[PDB]
C-alpha cells in the first residue's frame, strides 16, 4: 500500500503523479492549480482502485489542505512526510506523443499508458502494471 | 480484458461507468456532457491501468465519435456492440454519502470506493477490487 505523491509542470499546467513504490506503476492527472480539493479528489480515486495505506510527500503543501486531511481520514490513508527520474522519463515519453494529441492531458495519459505497459529495456520480465497486480495478488 | 461501458445521470450531470464484467469492479467519472473526447479520455486512462481488450456498449453513440475511434485504435481496445442494477446500487451508495461531499463527483468516487472495497453481504469472500487483481494475476 505504499505510494509517493509529487507534482510536476508542463505548458503551465500541473500534473499530479502517484507512484506505487515497489512496482513503479504511475497514475497521473492534469489539475487546475495545485488545490487541496483536486489532490483530495485524486487521492480518493486512487484509494478506491488500489490498496492505498501510506502516501509519502517531500514538502508541506499537502499537510495544509483541510480537504486532503478529510480524504486521508475518510479512505484510511496515512499521510507521511519524507521520501526515502520518474518525472523526467514521463516527460521524454510526453514529447514523443505530444503532437498525436490536442490536449496536454491526453499526452500525459498516453505517457502513463506506455510507462505502465512497457517492459524495462523493451523485452522480458514484467511491466509496472503487471508488477503492481502481482504484488497485490501476493 | 472484458468491460461494459454505460453512462448514467444525477443532478443533471453525466456519470461514465466502466464495469469489469468477471469481477464487478467499477470505475466512474463525472464528465461535461457525453462528448466523444471525454469518453475517449476515460477509455485511454482505464486501458493504461488495467488490460482493456474489449469494451461492450448497448447503443450507437460510441460508434459515432472520431476520438473514441482513435482512442480504441491507439490503445488496442475492440469496440463491440451488445451487452449479453449496477447503475442502481451505486446510486443507493451515492445517496448515503451525498451530504458528506460538496461535489457530486466526490460522492460518485466515495460510492465507487465502497462498491469496490465492500464484501458481498458484508462478510467473507472477496471485494470487486480484490477479484479484478486476482483474475489478472491469474
Ligand atoms: C473536488 C473535490 C473533493 O475530493 C474529495 C475527496 C474526499 C473527501 C472527504 C472530500 C473531497 C472533495 C470536496 C467535496 O466535494 O466535499
Ligand atoms: C479530451 C480528450 C482526448 O482523449 C483521448 C484519448 C486517445 C486519443 C488518441 C485522443 C484523445 C483526446 C483528444 C486529443 O487530446 O487529441
- The angle, 0 to 180 degrees and rounded to 10, between the axes of the packed helices B104-117 and A36-47 is 20
Contact A44 B106 (CB under 8 A): yes
A79 close to A56: Cβ distance less than 8 angstroms: no
CA of B68 to nearest chain A CA: how many angstroms apart? 12
Does the domain spanning A2-138 belong to CATH 3.40.50.2300?
no
Phi, psi of A58 (to 5 degrees): -105, -5
Bridge partners (DSSP) of residue B94 are none
Strand runs (DSSP E) across B12-114, as ranges? Answer: 13-20, 25-31, 54-57, 78-81
B19 close to B4: Cβ distance less than 8 angstroms: yes
Q: Which helix (H) or strand (E) holds A5?
A: strand A2-10
Q: List the end-to-end C-alpha distance of chain A, in Å, as a whole number.
A: 12
Nearest-angstrom CA–CA distance, A68 and A36: 6
If we measure between CA atoms, which residue out of B34, B39, B119 comes closest to residue B71?
A: B39
Q: How many helices (H) and strands (E) does chain A have?
A: 5, 5
**3-state SS class at B122:** helix
Nearest-angstrom CA–CA distance, B44 and A105: 11
Which strands, in side-by-side order, build the sheet including A13-20?
A25-31, A13-20, A2-10, A54-57, A78-81
Resolution at which this structure was determined, Å: 2.2
Instruction: Give A135's Cβ-side CA count (13 Å radius).
Output: 16
B101 close to B107: Cβ distance less than 8 angstroms: yes
B109 close to A45: Cβ distance less than 8 angstroms: yes
Contact B47 A113 (CB under 8 A): yes
Nearest-angstrom CA–CA distance, B65 and B45: 17
Instruction: Give B7's Cβ-side CA count (13 Å radius).
Output: 22
Nearest to A109 among B45, B50, B133 (CB): B45
Our answer on whether the CB atom of A99 is closer than 6 Å to any ligand 2 atom is no
Nearest-angstrom CA–CA distance, B136 and A136: 11
B75 close to B43: Cβ distance less than 8 angstroms: yes
- Spans of all domains in chain A: 2-138
**In sequence order, which residues have a C-beta less than 8 Å from that of residue A80 and are 6 or more positions away?**
A54, A55, A56, A57
Nearest-angstrom CA–CA distance, B105 and B14: 10
Ligand 2 centre distance from Cα of residue B71 (Å):
7
B61 close to B48: Cβ distance less than 8 angstroms: no
Chain-centre distance for alpha carbon B70? 20
Instruction: Give A70's Cβ-side CA count (13 Å radius).
Output: 13
**In sequence order, which residues have a C-beta less than 8 Å from that of residue B106 and are 6 or more positions away?**
A41, A44
Amino acid at each position: 500500500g505504499i505510494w509517493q505523491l509529487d507534482c510536476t509542470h508542463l505548458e503551465g499546467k500541473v500534473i499530479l503523479v502517484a507512484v506505487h513504490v515497489a512496482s513503479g506503476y504511475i497514475e497521473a492527472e492534469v489539475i487546475p492549480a495545485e488545490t487541496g480539493q483536486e489532490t483530495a479528489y485524486f487521492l480518493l480515486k486512487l484509494a478506491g482502485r488500489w490498496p492505498v495505506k501510506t502516501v509519502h510527500t517531500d514538502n508541506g503543501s499537502n499537510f495544509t489542505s483541510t480537504t486532503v486531511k478529510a480524504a486521508c481520514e475518510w479512505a484510511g490513508i496515512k499521510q507521511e512526510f519524507g521520501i526515502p527520474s520518474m518525472n523526467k522519463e514521463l516527460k521524454k515519453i510526453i514529447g514523443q506523443v505530444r503532437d498525436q494529441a490536442e490536449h496536454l492531458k491526453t499526452a500525459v495519459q498516453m505517457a502513463v499508458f506506455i510507462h505502465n505497459k512497457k517492459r524495462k529495456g523493451g523485452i522480458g520480465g514484467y511491466s509496472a502494471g503487471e508488477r503492481i497486480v502481482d504484488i497485490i495478488a501476493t
